[PDB]
């Protein structure tokens, strides 16, 4: 795991009985928590749903773990790790995602599968009325020799409001427990910004900055 790393991603899934597929490539600085991802919809494009709901399904290795906080993600290599997530929108939609992360010849390989159901046909997501995410904080705590994450996020809406969702994630290392220095309870602050898009969201460029921390309060 080096100062500059590349990544290839592979996504496929169904949102409201709408099948799609994506690929992407990107590079970032794993230790400064920055990363960039250039994505294509290679099937099912253009998508009938806001592309913003797939944003979080595109990289746990690019999180700055300062304060010598034990990095569960960088330690998991070369075996890699997996994550699972159920995202729950306050308006009904539910998006489950299962992901595999492997290192292949100095290159991170992501394999993502998505399944979203019960998204309201008149809501901002299916009407494509969304404008990107606000920054967010995730809280990670050890559980079952792995990590769990909890997060709330706010999706800016067209016309002013926010649509809120809640994230439940599970991170599992493929590396044996004994090799892993497990972290305490900690928090990730991050900001995910859409930097570019074209062709009705069949091309998107994403950037993310992500910094870890304990609580600095007394």
Show Cβ contacts of residue 144 under 8 Å, excluding neighbours closer than 6 positions: none
> Strand pairing partners for 173?
81
Give dist(CA 54, CA 200) in Å, integer.
Answer: 15
Give dist(CA 27, CA 19) in Å, integer.
Answer: 27
Q: Which residues of 171-193 are buried (b: 16+ CB within 10 A; e: fewer)?
A: bebebeeeebeebeebbbbbebe
Q: Phi/psi zone of residue 16: left (φ > 0), alpha (ψ -120 to 50 degrees), beta?
A: left
Show Cβ contacts of residue 198 under 8 Å, excluding neighbours closer than 6 positions: none
Q: Which domain holds residue 214?
A: 1-218
Can you give the length of the chain in residues?
218
In degrees, to the nearest 5, what angle opens at C-alpha 112 toward C-alphas 174 and 55?
120
Which tokens sit at 133? 């995410």
Q: Would you call the peptide bond into 46 cis, given omega within 30 degrees of 0 as the criterion?
A: yes
CATH (domain of 194):
2.40.155.10
> How far is the CA of 75 from the CAs of 5, 124, 173, in angstroms?
15, 39, 9
Q: Phi/psi zone of residue 91: left (φ > 0), alpha (ψ -120 to 50 degrees), beta?
A: alpha
Show Cβ contacts of residue 92 under 8 Å, excluding neighbours closer than 6 positions: 118, 119, 120, 123
Give dist(CA 39, CA 44) in Å, integer.
Answer: 14
> Strand pairing partners for 161?
none
DSSP-assigned states of every residue in 91-132: TS-EEEEEEEEEE-SSEEEEEEEEEEE---TTSTTTTT-EEE
Q: Please count the structural domains in the chain.
A: 1
DSSP 213: E
Which burial class, exposed, middle or buried, applies to 104 when counting CB atoms under 10 A from its CB (0-12, 13-18, 19+)? exposed
Instruction: Name the 3-class secondary structure at 41.
Output: strand
Give dist(CA 121, CA 190) in Å, integer.
Answer: 30
Give dist(CA 87, CA 193) in Å, integer.
Answer: 19
Q: Phi/psi zone of residue 202: left (φ > 0), alpha (ψ -120 to 50 degrees), beta?
A: alpha
Instruction: Name the 3-class secondary structure at 179.
Output: helix
Q: What are phi and psi of 71, to 5 degrees?
A: -85, 100
The 3 state secondary structure assigned to 48-85 is: CCCHHHHHHHCCCCCCECCCCCCCHHHHCCCCCEEEEE
Provide the sign of the torsion angle of the four alpha carbons 138, 140, 93, 97, taken in this order: positive
Provide the sign of the torsion angle of the four alpha carbons 150, 151, 152, 154, taken in this order: negative
Q: Would you call the peptide bond into 78 cis, given omega within 30 degrees of 0 as the criterion?
A: yes
Give dist(CA 92, CA 161) in Å, integer.
Answer: 17
First-residue to last-residue Cα distance in the chain: 34
DSSP 134: P
Residue with tokens 């709330």: 152
Do the Cβ atoms of 61 and 72 come closer than 8 Å? Answer: no
């Amino acid at each position: 795991i080096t100062e500059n790393m590349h990544m290839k991603l592979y996504m496929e899934g169904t949102v409201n009985n709408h099948h799609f597929k994506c690929t992407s490539e990107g590079e970032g600085k794993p230790y400064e928590g920055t990363q960039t991802m250039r994505i294509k919809v290679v099937e099912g494009g253009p998508l009938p749903f806001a592309f913003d709901i797939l944003a979080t399904s595109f990289s746990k290795t690019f999180i700055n773990h300062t304060q010598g906080i034990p990095d569960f993600f960088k330690q998991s290599f070369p075996e890699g790790f997996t994550w699972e997530r159920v995202t729950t929108y306050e308006d009904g939609g539910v998006l489950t995602a299962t992901q595999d992360t492997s290192l292949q010849d100095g290159c991170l390989i992501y394999n993502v599968k998505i399944r979203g159901v019960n998204f309201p046909s008149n809501g901002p997501v299916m009407q494509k009325k969304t404008l990107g995410w606000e920054a967010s904080t995730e809280m990670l705590y050890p559980a079952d020799g792995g990590l769990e994450g909890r997060s709330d996020m706010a999706l800016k809406l067209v016309g002013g409001g926010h649509l809120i969702c809640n994230l439940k994630t599970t991170y599992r290392s493929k590396k044996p427990a004994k090799n892993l220095k497990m972290p305490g309870v900690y928090y990730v602050d991050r900001r995910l910004e859409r930097i570019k898009e074209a062709d009705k969201e069949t091309y998107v460029e994403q950037h993310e900055v992500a910094v870890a921390r304990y609580c600095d309060l007394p």
